[PDB]
Amino acid sequence: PMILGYWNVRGLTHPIRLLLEYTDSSYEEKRYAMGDAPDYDRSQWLNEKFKLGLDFPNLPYLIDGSRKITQSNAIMRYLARKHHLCGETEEERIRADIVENQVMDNRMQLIMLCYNPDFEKQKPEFLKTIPEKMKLYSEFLGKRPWFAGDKVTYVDFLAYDILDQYHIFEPKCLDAFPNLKDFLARFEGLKKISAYMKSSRYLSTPIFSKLAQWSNK
Amino acid sequence: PMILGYWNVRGLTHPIRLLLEYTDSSYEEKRYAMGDAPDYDRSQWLNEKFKLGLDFPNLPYLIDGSRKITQSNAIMRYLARKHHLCGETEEERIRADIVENQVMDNRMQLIMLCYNPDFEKQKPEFLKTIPEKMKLYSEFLGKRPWFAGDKVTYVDFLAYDILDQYHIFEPKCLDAFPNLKDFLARFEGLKKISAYMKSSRYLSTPIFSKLAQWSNK
Numbered sequence: 001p002m003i004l005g006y007w008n009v010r011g012l013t014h015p016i017r018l019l020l021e022y023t024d025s026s027y028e029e030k031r032y033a034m035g036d037a038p039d040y041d042r043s044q045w046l047n048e049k050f051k052l053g054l055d056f057p058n059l060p061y062l063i064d065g066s067r068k069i070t071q072s073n074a075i076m077r078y079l080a081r082k083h084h085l086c087g088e089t090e091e092e093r094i095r096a097d098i099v100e101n102q103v104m105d106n107r108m109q110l111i112m113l114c115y116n117p118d119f120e121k122q123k124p125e126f127l128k129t130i131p132e133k134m135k136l137y138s139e140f141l142g143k144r145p146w147f148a149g150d151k152v153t154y155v156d157f158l159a160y161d162i163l164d165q166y167h168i169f170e171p172k173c174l175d176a177f178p179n180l181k182d183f184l185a186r187f188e189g190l191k192k193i194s195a196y197m198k199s200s201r202y203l204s205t206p207i208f209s210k211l212a213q214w215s216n217k
Numbered sequence: 218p219m220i221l222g223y224w225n226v227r228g229l230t231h232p233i234r235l236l237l238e239y240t241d242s243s244y245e246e247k248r249y250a251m252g253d254a255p256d257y258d259r260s261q262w263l264n265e266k267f268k269l270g271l272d273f274p275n276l277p278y279l280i281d282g283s284r285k286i287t288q289s290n291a292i293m294r295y296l297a298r299k300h301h302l303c304g305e306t307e308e309e310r311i312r313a314d315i316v317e318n319q320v321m322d323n324r325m326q327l328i329m330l331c332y333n334p335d336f337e338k339q340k341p342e343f344l345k346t347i348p349e350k351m352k353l354y355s356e357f358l359g360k361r362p363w364f365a366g367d368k369v370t371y372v373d374f375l376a377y378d379i380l381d382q383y384h385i386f387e388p389k390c391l392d393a394f395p396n397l398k399d400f401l402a403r404f405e406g407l408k409k410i411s412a413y414m415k416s417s418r419y420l421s422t423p424i425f426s427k428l429a430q431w432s433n434k
């Protein structure tokens with residue numbers, strides 16, 4: 001089988017776990033654990049970081065036979081090409097390129113606030129900003145059923161993830177965008193997905209390490 | 218022609234400027250300026266940020282007639298596809314994806330150092346880490362002429378830039394790494410790049426905005 005390695009956290013690997021399932025990949029995961037405070041030992045990983053033969057060692061990684069990959073986006077694109085889940089048209093490619101990089105931006109912003117020592121001070125001004133981030137998702141999708149077009153592509157996995165996360169963080173952030181909420185239910189309703197969500201392998205939380213101030217446990 | 222817009226800095230757009238020159242593209246630039254401390258006015262951009270028809274307004278943006286794109290990597294890929302500078306085989310495609318992503322991480326690490334009020338006391342820890350980053354790019358290029366393989370692809374633009382920037386930060390960081398000093402000279406040796414480095418348009422520094430602690434003027 002293929003081997004997925006990551007922390008025993010949702011982090012940024014939710015979209016890869018979901019694509020592996022949707023595509024019926026035959027895989028196993030090694031979920032590394034971080035020691036507890038104060039130290040938050042990372043030795044379970046560090047001990048083999050440089051022994052897997054990865055060009056640029058990092059988590060997540062994917063071993064797929066003789067193919068070895070790091071960087072979540074490259075893993076996602078690798079799977080997308082393997083299982084034909086890319087945009088077919090120039091327009092679809094442009095939309096997937098954009099979204100793919102927009103979700104990373106929006107992710108880094110959440111990670112930054114979340115691991116910010118002044119998280120409580122920070123919520124307030126950060127939440128005033130969500131509505132305009134959702135609007136931009138909302139208008140981009142418009143009436144299309146999926147982000148690049150007429151077909152589910154790997155970016156739907158990235159966009160579902162990030163929208164789901166913003167929603168955990170601000171339950172009402174989406175009341176004003178029925179099309180986003182509609183997107184989250186169309187996505188949760190794909191066949192292998194609904195099944196994966198009721199399984200032992202499913203991990204929606206925690207999101208971050210115990211380092212976090214949010215969704216850290 | 219095509220319109221590229223970004224700040225009047227190198228920032229994260231050096232690779233696009235290079236790619237437009239290497240490909241003999243017809244293009245005009247809009248270089249936005251920002252005020253000086255203490256409030257660093259961004260009003261030149263802000264006045265037109267929501268007036269361009271951009272899906273997710275941001276800098277850099279590229280406009281190619283109908284097509285309006287944001288996110289640097291999406292602009293890079295659009296230019297790559299147009300001018301056939303994409304990997305050709307799967308092996309080239311994975312190497313491209315990884316590098317693209319590895320570049321952005323190494324770039325985010327430098328930006329975070331450089332925008333930390335603690336620059337000076339923090340810098341010496343940052344320097345200790347460089348040798349290991351460069352060894353990774355080094356062992357990855359190996360003996361290949363270019364990053365994805367035997368031909369220049371869009372990723373050599375992303376790689377030239379991040380090696381060039383770290384090289385400006387630590388002039389001696391590449392001494393142990395011949396294939397990289399060499400890569401730097403092969404790239405610069407490209408006809409249209411060599412031509413462009415001497416032109417009126419060339420903008421090497423500053424790299425960061427007036428806010429940074431390093432290379433801000």
Ligand SMILES: N[C@@H](CCC(=O)N[C@@H](CS)C(=O)NCC(=O)O)C(=O)O
Binds near residue numbers: 071
């Ligand atoms: N940009 C990388 C993020 C890599 C990264 O930041 N990995 C964190 C987990 S989110 C890590 O623990 N890295 C392993 C390491 O550096 O040793 C990706 O998108 O895959």
Ligand SMILES: N[C@@H](CCC(=O)N[C@@H](CS)C(=O)NCC(=O)O)C(=O)O
Binds near residue numbers: 275287289
């Ligand atoms: N992930 C984006 C980063 C973009 C970004 O943060 N843009 C900066 C300059 S590097 C900016 O000034 N944005 C202007 C704004 O927010 O209105 C990219 O790769 O293009």
